[PDB]
Amino acid sequence: DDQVKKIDKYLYAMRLSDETLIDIMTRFRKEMKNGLSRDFNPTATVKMLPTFVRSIPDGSEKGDFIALDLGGSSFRILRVQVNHEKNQNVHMESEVYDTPENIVHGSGSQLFDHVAECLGDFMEKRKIKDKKLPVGFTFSFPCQQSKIDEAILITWTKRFKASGVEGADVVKLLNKAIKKRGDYDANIVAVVNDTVGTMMTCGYDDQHCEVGLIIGTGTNACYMEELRHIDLVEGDEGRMCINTEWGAFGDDGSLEDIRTEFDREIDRGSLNPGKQLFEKMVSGMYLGELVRLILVKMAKEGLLFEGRITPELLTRGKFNTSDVSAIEKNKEGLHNAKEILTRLGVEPSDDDCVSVQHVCTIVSFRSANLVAATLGAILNRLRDNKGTPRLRTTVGVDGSLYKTHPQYSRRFHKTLRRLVPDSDVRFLLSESGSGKGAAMVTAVAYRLAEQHRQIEETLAHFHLTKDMLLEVKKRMRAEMELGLRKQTHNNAVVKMLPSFVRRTPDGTENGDFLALDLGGTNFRVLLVKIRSGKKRTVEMHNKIYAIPIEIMQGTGEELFDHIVSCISDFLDYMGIKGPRMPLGFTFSFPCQQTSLDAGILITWTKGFKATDCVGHDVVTLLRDAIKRREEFDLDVVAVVNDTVGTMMTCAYEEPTCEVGLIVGTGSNACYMEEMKNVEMVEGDQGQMCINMEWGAFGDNGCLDDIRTHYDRLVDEYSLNAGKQRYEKMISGMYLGEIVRNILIDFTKKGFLFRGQISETLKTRGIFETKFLSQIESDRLALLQVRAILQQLGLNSTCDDSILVKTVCGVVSRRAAQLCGAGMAAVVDKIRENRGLDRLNVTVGVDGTLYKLHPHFSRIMHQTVKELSPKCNVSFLLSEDGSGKGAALITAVGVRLRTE
Amino acid sequence: DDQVKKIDKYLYAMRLSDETLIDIMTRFRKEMKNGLSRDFNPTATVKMLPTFVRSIPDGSEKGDFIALDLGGSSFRILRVQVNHEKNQNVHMESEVYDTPENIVHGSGSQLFDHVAECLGDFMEKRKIKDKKLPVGFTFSFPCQQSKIDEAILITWTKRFKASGVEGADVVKLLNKAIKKRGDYDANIVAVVNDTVGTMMTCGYDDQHCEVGLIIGTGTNACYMEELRHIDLVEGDEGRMCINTEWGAFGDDGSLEDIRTEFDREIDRGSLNPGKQLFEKMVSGMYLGELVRLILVKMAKEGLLFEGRITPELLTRGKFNTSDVSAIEKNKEGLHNAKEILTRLGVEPSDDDCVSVQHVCTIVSFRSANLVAATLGAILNRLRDNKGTPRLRTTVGVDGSLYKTHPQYSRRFHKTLRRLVPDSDVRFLLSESGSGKGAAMVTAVAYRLAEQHRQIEETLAHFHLTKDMLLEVKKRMRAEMELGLRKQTHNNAVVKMLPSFVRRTPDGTENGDFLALDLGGTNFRVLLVKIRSGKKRTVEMHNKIYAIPIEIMQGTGEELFDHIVSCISDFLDYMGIKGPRMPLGFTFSFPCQQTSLDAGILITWTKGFKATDCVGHDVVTLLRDAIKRREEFDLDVVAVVNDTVGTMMTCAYEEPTCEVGLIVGTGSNACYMEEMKNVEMVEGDQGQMCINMEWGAFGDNGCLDDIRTHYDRLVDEYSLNAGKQRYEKMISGMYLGEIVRNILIDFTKKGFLFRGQISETLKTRGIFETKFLSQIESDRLALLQVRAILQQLGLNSTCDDSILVKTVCGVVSRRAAQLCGAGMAAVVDKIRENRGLDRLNVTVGVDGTLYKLHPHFSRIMHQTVKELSPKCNVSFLLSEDGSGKGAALITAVGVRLRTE
Ligand SMILES: O=P(O)(O)OC[C@H]1OC[C@H](O)[C@@H](O)[C@@H]1O
Ligand SMILES: O=P(O)(O)OC[C@H]1OC[C@H](O)[C@@H](O)[C@@H]1O
Ligand SMILES: O=P(O)(O)OC[C@H]1OC[C@H](O)[C@@H](O)[C@@H]1O
Ligand SMILES: O=P(O)(O)OC[C@H]1OC[C@H](O)[C@@H](O)[C@@H]1O
Ligand SMILES: OC[C@H]1O[C@@H](O)[C@H](O)[C@@H](O)[C@@H]1O
Ligand SMILES: OC[C@H]1O[C@@H](O)[C@H](O)[C@@H](O)[C@@H]1O
Ligand SMILES: OC[C@H]1O[C@@H](O)[C@H](O)[C@@H](O)[C@@H]1O
Ligand SMILES: OC[C@H]1O[C@@H](O)[C@H](O)[C@@H](O)[C@@H]1O
Ligand code: NA
Ligand code: NA
Numbered sequence A, B: 001d002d003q004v005k006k007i008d009k010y011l012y013a014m015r016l017s018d019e020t021l022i023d024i025m026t027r028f029r030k031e032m033k034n035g036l037s038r039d040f041n042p043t044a045t046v047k048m049l050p051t052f053v054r055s056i057p058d059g060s061e062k063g064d065f066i067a068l069d070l071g072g073s074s075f076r077i078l079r080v081q082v083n084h085e086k087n088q089n090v091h092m093e094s095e096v097y098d099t100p101e102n103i104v105h106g107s108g109s110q111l112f113d114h115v116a117e118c119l120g121d122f123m124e125k126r127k128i129k130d131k132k133l134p135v136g137f138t139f140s141f142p143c144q145q146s147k148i149d150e151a152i153l154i155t156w157t158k159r160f161k162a163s164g165v166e167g168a169d170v171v172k173l174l175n176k177a178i179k180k181r182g183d184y185d186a187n188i189v190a191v192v193n194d195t196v197g198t199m200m201t202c203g204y205d206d207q208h209c210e211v212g213l214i215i216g217t218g219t220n221a222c223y224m225e226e227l228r229h230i231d232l233v234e235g236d237e238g239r240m241c242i243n244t245e246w247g248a249f250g251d252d253g254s255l256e257d258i259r260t261e262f263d264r265e266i267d268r269g270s271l272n273p274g275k276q277l278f279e280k281m282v283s284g285m286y287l288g289e290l291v292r293l294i295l296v297k298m299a300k301e302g303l304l305f306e307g308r309i310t311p312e313l314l315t316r317g318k319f320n321t322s323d324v325s326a327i328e329k330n331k332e333g334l335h336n337a338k339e340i341l342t343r344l345g346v347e348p349s350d351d352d353c354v355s356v357q358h359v360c361t362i363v364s365f366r367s368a369n370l371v372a373a374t375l376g377a378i379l380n381r382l383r384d385n386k387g388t389p390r391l392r393t394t395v396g397v398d399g400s401l402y403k404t405h406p407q408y409s410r411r412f413h414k415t416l417r418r419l420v421p422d423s424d425v426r427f428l429l430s431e432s433g434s435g436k437g438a439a440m441v442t443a444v445a446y447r448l449a450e451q452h453r454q455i456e457e458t459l460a461h462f463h464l465t466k467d468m469l470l471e472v473k474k475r476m477r478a479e480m481e482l483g484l485r486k487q488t489h490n491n492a493v494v495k496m497l498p499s500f501v502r503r504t505p506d507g508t509e510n511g512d513f514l515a516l517d518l519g520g521t522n523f524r525v526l527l528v529k530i531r532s533g534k535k536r537t538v539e540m541h542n543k544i545y546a547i548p549i550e551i552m553q554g555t556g557e558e559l560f561d562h563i564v565s566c567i568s569d570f571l572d573y574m575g576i577k578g579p580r581m582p583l584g585f586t587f588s589f590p591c592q593q594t595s596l597d598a599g600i601l602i603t604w605t606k607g608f609k610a611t612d613c614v615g616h617d618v619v620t621l622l623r624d625a626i627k628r629r630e631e632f633d634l635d636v637v638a639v640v641n642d643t644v645g646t647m648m649t650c651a652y653e654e655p656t657c658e659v660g661l662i663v664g665t666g667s668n669a670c671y672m673e674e675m676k677n678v679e680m681v682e683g684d685q686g687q688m689c690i691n692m693e694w695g696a697f698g699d700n701g702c703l704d705d706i707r708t709h710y711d712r713l714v715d716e717y718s719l720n721a722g723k724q725r726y727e728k729m730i731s732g733m734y735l736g737e738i739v740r741n742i743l744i745d746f747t748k749k750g751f752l753f754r755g756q757i758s759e760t761l762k763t764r765g766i767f768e769t770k771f772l773s774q775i776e777s778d779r780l781a782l783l784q785v786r787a788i789l790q791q792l793g794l795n796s797t798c799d800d801s802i803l804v805k806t807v808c809g810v811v812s813r814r815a816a817q818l819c820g821a822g823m824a825a826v827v828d829k830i831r832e833n834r835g836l837d838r839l840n841v842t843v844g845v846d847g848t849l850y851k852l853h854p855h856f857s858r859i860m861h862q863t864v865k866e867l868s869p870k871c872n873v874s875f876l877l878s879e880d881g882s883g884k885g886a887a888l889i890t891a892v893g894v895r896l897r898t899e
């Protein structure tokens, strides 16, 4: 006892007590907390890296997979075949490639080229290059993953230093080194940590496995954590495997009172000074050498062999954990210690051999005790999540040390169970390695990969490029031409209708005007009072009047009686019943005109279809509904299309306002044109405002190029089948629908709502402008998004919400973009018409979709600016409605009449 | 009696029960929680905007301020003066300015140009224009604030609708309106909501006053919410006045079951259709017209005036809420209902007057009842905060209606005191409106505005303009030339020492070399085995040895005796003791070299001041300690600076590299200069890497230009006063010390740490590179930054942490730019030496400040790009240290020696 006694008193600091271990444990417990909290994560040494593995295998994984295993004692490559539906469970073959020391400490390129080459040599032997086999990647180092197939190396550990790897996505680095060879293709579907990998392996045979553990070259552990506790992953649903990365633990001085002069000296010689402190006390790469240090310290101090000391004893890595194992064999325990200590030059006496074996013991035990301490924390953590007095769980393990040490396994277990009383723990040992597990994750990885591929492959058809966009503008131009040239006007889709407004306001418009605003999302009667001269003012009041669905789709007689009805009421409300006033009629519909106060409804659009209106002069329909009353009489000087009225309202300000745009229920644009070009109206003196009716753009197929299965469906089920094609790809009355139909599809395809087509989802109108704008709203939270959707009647999860958002984004974007190419063609024509090399024009705007969308206006403006660089366009948003612009046309009407 | 028992059933919808008001309340309690939680906040109609007001006045309030009050019944301008120091009670003269509906409905321009013209007159009547007066602003509308110094009009309400105002900064807007006038200077310290301005006015006379209430043209409330409850404000300490903005209560259809056919109509005729619904139910602007609509309805069904309905009864707003107040008088109520109703022109009967007066009662009695329901939820919420089984608080109030309607207060309180009987509420009416409470706010805001301005005024000295950086660059270049020319060299501060390395590695370097790395954060010995040929490999090992406090500032002999000692051990550590190998000695201090193997220390820099070293050849000093130990023998083949070493390291793989940069403990650079320019080394063929030693830059005064008080304190207390000045504005060993001085100063000024200089703060070295990097980390939580500060022992609050952070930012940013100008000069020269127009070049970097700091590199790279637009610099980060580079140097060294 003399010998052993002294040593124990010597290496006292390396013998941890249950008291202390409990201490250590409570620490790691905090470290896990701080590694999970969004607030303290950026400082915690224990990182708790999310891994995007949502659970251990559920048996439903089949296919042929290839798995890479790098970072372990050996670089292994495997092929895993899993076929339950075919009486074949798990077969796997592997080959271990050598990777020389230079390769591991050299340039990243060497490394990943070396890997790709091996993968090439591997696939060549199995003659499988021609098989699209999903590839998993076991990369045993800490990684920043935002998705399972992305691995941003945070920092090398153990035996690896490769230049130009840290802070990079190894998934890419490899993809890269793979492409430079050319010998094959690799679909690297997922990258996993060896703990995760091992946990998945073990959990394949044990439905209770909730933790992976590695006690090999390095040491780390991964467990299953509640998403509610993972701050760094938007969600609260289910579980995900966290990769604690505990080697780092105490790297912030946290475990200084535990580290010893030996742990500090072993460090100052490590490949990554200051880091992986906890690891350098536990894992196999260190234990042996950690001994060699103590030994030397002693021998110099006369505690060994008369104090002799050979160069071999002083040499680095002359005492491997391997030797540290044999010295712990009871059968050869001391015997082995003889052969080892003999080969080290020193003269090993029988007492010595005992002394040494004891050091080993103290060391080996500490690592074992340490890991027990932390693994205990994890265990307690898992139990707390269940809220049950006891906890049962399996723990997959691996690590050359664990496997080959004769005491470690046993001691570690003993100590652990002692430290976590209220729980039964199973330690299943992985004999195949993390390979089987990798492939199991790679299965779910690739299964999800495919779903995306399809989704994107679909949404792709909504991606318009700078070129496609130019082309649209170009055509838009062409269509404008056809619409103007009376020769082709009849067969032209873009009608380029004349509004009979010849000049923007000049500031003399004076008087009182009754205005009607119909066609939008709100029918309303307006009263506008304008003053001109020294001080100019524009007072105005208005009332909204609902139009019942029946009436909107009843008959012209009724509708227009309902109008004149409201017209009358508003006259009361205003107390101006009596004198016969002039009225500006804002009718939002393609109307053929011959004068300002005459307009024949060419066709219904948007939501309206009232019978016996088309082909009529709406002014007449009106004057006729009034006559059918007689309560009052008034002079409708003008019928104005809202694009035009809008413009005028804005050109009020704003003399360079020569263009009107509307993006709301419907989409449409007007502008000033030189009479010489307006072939459909006599004259070539002065200008003229043109109501483009660009909605019809593509009603001849000139857009069938970029139109999708979804656009078509929406068009088909519309009231105006085959008409206003353009519009139906822009305005709010449609965009929602476009999306709805995509979703439906995506749903049957199995991508949403677990394949359940909500009754609701079968409802048209769901995705209104209002709602559509809330979703895309920036920096919104998944719970928020999922909320907005739950309020529609859509039982959707986060994942779901991510997709719906993504979809709405695509649809609204293409909208803003298409709209842009439109405006682009307009302004650029104007510029060329006037022969300028650069043009400064402002565009008046109105329409809810535009007002309420988070990105529409922006996405679109950027588009106009990019297509028509020679144009500099402003976008003044109208806030008062058409009323004002309408009354300004009315006045010039009453005037020109008298004058 | 049936005359009234009837109406009481007709307007049955408008008579809410206690059972009902409980529901409403419960719902508003939820709406508040929604407006607070960062997640659902965007979806909430009850915004719950923060107000940046931490508590009701305490009395310390002192000064003379001007207060604006707009959005109320009237646009008011007042003056407030208070100083209890001079024993002056609150004094305040006010005034009112007319405001035509045309303005309120015109454009922002007109409006704020008007507000400016008024305040203009107001100050031109007290002739207070000259006195710089703090101005505060009541508005009266919902606004978005990050500053409190700023107001973003979310939306117009009540009477107002102005073009160009919404989603803009009313502050900036007014500022402009004033600016254009040039009539005066008005500095607008803060804006508040009249609900806040009120609560403050009351809290001033009464404490426990925690709520602000308005019942005038519109309605709204504000209260004191717990910061740990306001998700939208980084904090948890204390409380802040939240502006509920309840007018928009139910705008989302939550209150569709309370709204009647009547509410719906007044809305369809309101300025803001669909919005401020709850308000439109309860507020002075609406009560009158809500009546007139109930009267026209009944009078249509003949229930009123024999069913006679004249034009004046139909006209909008012919029924003022003034009349609603007059009619409900106890003595002359019916007497007024007659004169008023006769004004209508309906022949009014002594029966009608009694029916109508009852209609009013049902209306107003509702309004009040509602306010109750809501204000109840506020009170309750307050009671939850305090935790007290009973709430005892005071509620400031104001608003034309609540103030002039006889029955209203009476009814309102009672209904409230009943709904939440678990409380004792005092209803202090406000007698000055808000002008007081506003000025009570402008005061604290102005107090802060002053500190800020002062801090900014100071930090502004660390701000360098494009032109300044160019000038710095320029000077650098000047000093470079001085150092190269034999004529001016002896007196040049930038020494341009020759490293006697003539070309970057060339692939022939082969052999085993020992290495030294002295002068960084870590002293260490290395072993670098290079293998050239077809297959090239670099294997290296190293051990960090600590240089004790003493040895570092003790004796030349001691220092090198220690080095040799460590050198010895390491020969052991590798087990290569015996052989005589070449040693590449990386010494990071300015050395005058006459050959590769001879270097005479010029001057100590950084941490070191070993005695009897300056003047000596370091190689010698080494050999000397070598002979002295007489243990092993080495063939020191070269001395090498870490700038050079680092270039060589990085050049090994990247041959386009010709520059070395070290931003760590100290800072310095090296590059390949043309031998023909190295007027200090005979010959002019090929090149030679120059060790710039640019730390000394500014040491001859050429930087006093941009140096600050703080810089001088750091340099003054430094080990080497008046030396390495440029470096002491860049490198990690000094930035911290600069910050420390800034903070210390701001503390004595009272800006931090409650003006108490912590013993900690006086400790030099506090702000290590490690910590500086943390504080400046991106998207970090104040709770985290406050955590890091209390770690160093700095007990700091949220506001403190913010300032410290800002400070660190300022200093690191400057350093990053000064470093950039430094480089920019270096590469722009290389560009000329090669006579290129564009020059591609890469630099080899290293240094803990460069590696760890989150912004340094970026800002520094950005800077080099802006200052040398003709060069394209790439910064390759060295990961292996100088060892390799110095080995490659030592390789060529031996090739010349064995020559
Ligand atoms: O081989 P080592 O590093 O000692 O032990 C750990 C290794 O065990 C073998 C596994 O296949 C591998 O994923 C793991 O990383
Ligand atoms: O309400 P929507 O259709 O989204 O926007 C379009 C409407 O905007 C309001 C205008 O006053 C009206 O003329 C126009 O038709
Ligand atoms: O005057 P109103 O709008 O009826 O009542 C509310 C008003 O009370 C008087 C205050 O000075 C003002 O800030 C507030 O807006
Ligand atoms: O530790 P510091 O001084 O910040 O970084 C500078 C040091 O970087 C590592 C280099 O191998 C060494 O030559 C250099 O002195
Ligand atoms: O080899 C097992 C462990 O080694 C540690 O050094 C790494 O940080 C872990 O990522 C890995 O799981
Ligand atoms: O309401 C905006 C636009 O909607 C289009 O669908 C109508 O056909 C146009 O007349 C109108 O300018
Ligand atoms: O002025 C009383 C209330 O009126 C409401 O319309 C405004 O939105 C509030 O900001 C204000 O407190
Ligand atoms: O450590 C980097 C730099 O620090 C300066 O103070 C030294 O004088 C230089 O020799 C060195 O390049
Ligand atoms: Na989460
Ligand atoms: Na014409």
Ligand code: NA
Binding pocket: B227, B228, B229, B230, B231, B232, B233, B234, B235, B236
């Ligand atoms: Na807060």
Ligand code: NA
Binding pocket: B675, B676, B677, B678, B679, B680, B681, B682, B683, B684
């Ligand atoms: Na020379």
